[PDB]
Design a protein around this ligand. Structure first.
Ligand SMILES: NC(=[NH2+])NCCC[C@H](N)C(=O)O
Length: 554
């Protein structure tokens, strides 16, 4: 019976809890996406939803557990027997592999294959597209590693004492290393099957499923991996016999067919679009099949000290005070569906999350214009000034327009520069030269961490060492405060998680003191779940349903 005709578990039932629990194996899970995968090479994917799909295809040393609660944020032993063994003050990480495990072709998984996967990341000329956190942590600047296609000498910082042991000797302490071991670029790839640029056409699988067929822009079918051993996998229930992804639908077409029951779940997970949002949130039966989680993305405005007059802290504080947070949230969808207002940066899933509101916007949250004008006077610009805000067409433009309206009230006169959506991070707001070319003193953007920790969340946004001069830059103000950098370094060797949280609170406070980032909202989304899908929950590390946990009702 289609969803509109029978009530489900209830609004938000899959947020922090598991809906429709079952161990029943069998059936075909019908997934849908508006977009094709970015890559089927585990090293070359960045899409959050493809990382989710990778939980079906490939195992890793550590993986996020199948848990809707806070424990879901802590990597658990997967291919490893236990969590990474830390020595040398957070600089050496040792893992011990489970024995006798096999790929889909029946061949053995060994520590050499995990080293090979990590080595492949270095071949950015052949395998671009995935995360590269591992490179600075493992590369010797005095003796650079050119990747495994250009030399057969192994990476010197990665030891394999035997077939079931791997040791990573890092260039610096790194508290969050288990998280890097949970990313798909660290899933084992045996060198014997590594076809390099072509690997995605026929990747090996260590997970419960393997690729049966991929037809670009059309479909992806997965079948069981006959060599995966259920008894050896503490993460994956592997309930369906088959997973079939339909690719390429218009987003409203997708929502309509999903709600009609023609597909079980939206894999891409961008949420219901406006039309279906209205329909679902208004209907008592449809509400019972909907979850409204935080996505852990932050929507914010960045201000760039390299673009006068934004070099002046008082100019930046004036902007913070004059922000109409209500208007800005409304631009984000927000009378009722505009995410969650925030005056700070960390999502509330992180330990360091704190009350921090250095520039309050008045009793109605619409702006403290007196405070803003006083800041403008401090800047020597009491009547305001002219500037340019960079944005994208669409939702980001409505937000930019809300900034224009907000700031006009204190004589800050903004014009809007739109930049190409596709390349916004590579060549647009994410490229320091572009920001200078168009004189973009303000930039509208959003961000989600590549792993659910304070470092993963905040370092790319504020750490001076993370400024990407050639594009893909996420530190838009190009903040390079040695005190912030030093505090971040301290967190990375601090073993005690509580002391670590306090240091991160100091970092976030210092960042807000600089006033280079204006937080707007933490984003939220509406996911629809058909009632015959079992084990549905929003994975706290992803903000999307954990597809791999799902089954089908009898
Ligand atoms: N694997 C992921 N978490 N992908 C989505 C986030 C990618 C990147 N941090 C961004 O905000 O654009």
């Amino acid at each position: 019976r289609p969803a509109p005709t029978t009530a489900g578990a209830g609004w938000d039932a899959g947020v922090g809890a598991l809906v429709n629990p079952s161990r029943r194996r069998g059936g075909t899970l019908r997934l849908v996406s508006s977009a094709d995968v970015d890559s089927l090479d585990p090293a070359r994917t960045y899409y959050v939803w493809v990382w989710l799909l990778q939980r079906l295809l490939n195992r890793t040393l550590m993986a996020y557990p199948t848990d809707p609660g806070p424990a879901g944020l802590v990597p658990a032993p997967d291919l490893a027997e236990g969590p990474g063994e830390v020595s040398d003050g957070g600089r050496t990480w040792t893992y011990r592999l489970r024995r006798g495990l096999r790929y889909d072709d029946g061949t053995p998984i060994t520590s050499d294959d995990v080293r090979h996967a990590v080595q492949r990341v270095f071949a950015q000329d052949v395998l671009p597209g995935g995360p590269t956190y591992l490179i600075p942590l493992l590369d010797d600047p005095e003796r650079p590693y050119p990747g495994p296609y250009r030399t057969d000498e192994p990476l010197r910082s990665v030891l394999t004492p035997d077939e079931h042991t791997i040791v990573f000797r890092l260039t610096r302490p790194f508290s969050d290393f288990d998280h890097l071991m949970a990313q798909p670029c660290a899933a084992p790839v045996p060198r014997r099957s590594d076809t390099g640029a072509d690997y995605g056409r026929d990747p090996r699988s260590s997970g419960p499923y393997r690729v049966a067929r991929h037809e670009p822009d059309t479909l992806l079918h997965l079948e069981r991996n006959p060599h995966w051993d259920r008894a050896t996998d503490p993460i994956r229930p592997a309930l369906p016999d088959r997973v079939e992804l339909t690719i390429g639908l218009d987003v409203d077409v997708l929502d309509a067919r999903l709600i009609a029951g023609e597909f079980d779940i939206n894999l891409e997970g961008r949420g219901l679009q406006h039309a279906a949002q209205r329909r679902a949130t208004a209907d008592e039966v449809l509400r019972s099949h909907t979850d409204n989680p935080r996505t852990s993305f932050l929507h914010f405005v960045a201000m760039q000290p390299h673009i006068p007059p934004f070099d002046n802290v008082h100019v930046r504080r004036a902007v913070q005070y004059a922000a109409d947070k209500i208007l800005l949230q409304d631009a984000r969808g927000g009378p009722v569906n505009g995410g969650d207002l925030t005056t700070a940066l960390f999502p509330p899933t992180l330990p360091a999350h704190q009350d921090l509101d250095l520039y309050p916007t008045g009793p109605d949250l619409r702006g403290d214009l007196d405070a803003a004008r006083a800041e403008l006077a401090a800047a020597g610009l009491p009547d305001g000034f002219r500037a340019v805000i960079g944005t994208q067409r669409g939702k980001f433009r409505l937000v930019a327009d809300a900034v224009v309206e907000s700031l006009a009230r204190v004589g800050i006169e903004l014009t809007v520069k739109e930049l190409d959506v596709a390349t916004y991070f590579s060549l647009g707001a994410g490229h320091p030269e572009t920001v200078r070319e168009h004189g973009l003193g303000l930039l509208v953007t959003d961000w989600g961490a590549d792993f659910p920790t304070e470092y993963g969340f905040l370092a790319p946004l504020v750490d001076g060492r993370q400024i990407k001069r050639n594009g893909g830059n996420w530190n838009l103000p190009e903040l390079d405060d040695p005190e912030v950098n030093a505090l971040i370094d301290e967190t990375l060797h601090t073993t005690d998680p509580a002391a670590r949280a306090e240091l991160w609170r100091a970092v976030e406070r210092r960042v807000m003191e600089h006033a280079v980032l204006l937080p707007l909202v933490h984003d939220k989304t509406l996911h629809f779940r058909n009632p015959w899908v079992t084990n549905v929950y929003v994975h706290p590390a992803f903000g999307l349903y954990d597809i791999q946990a799902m089954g089908l009702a009898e």
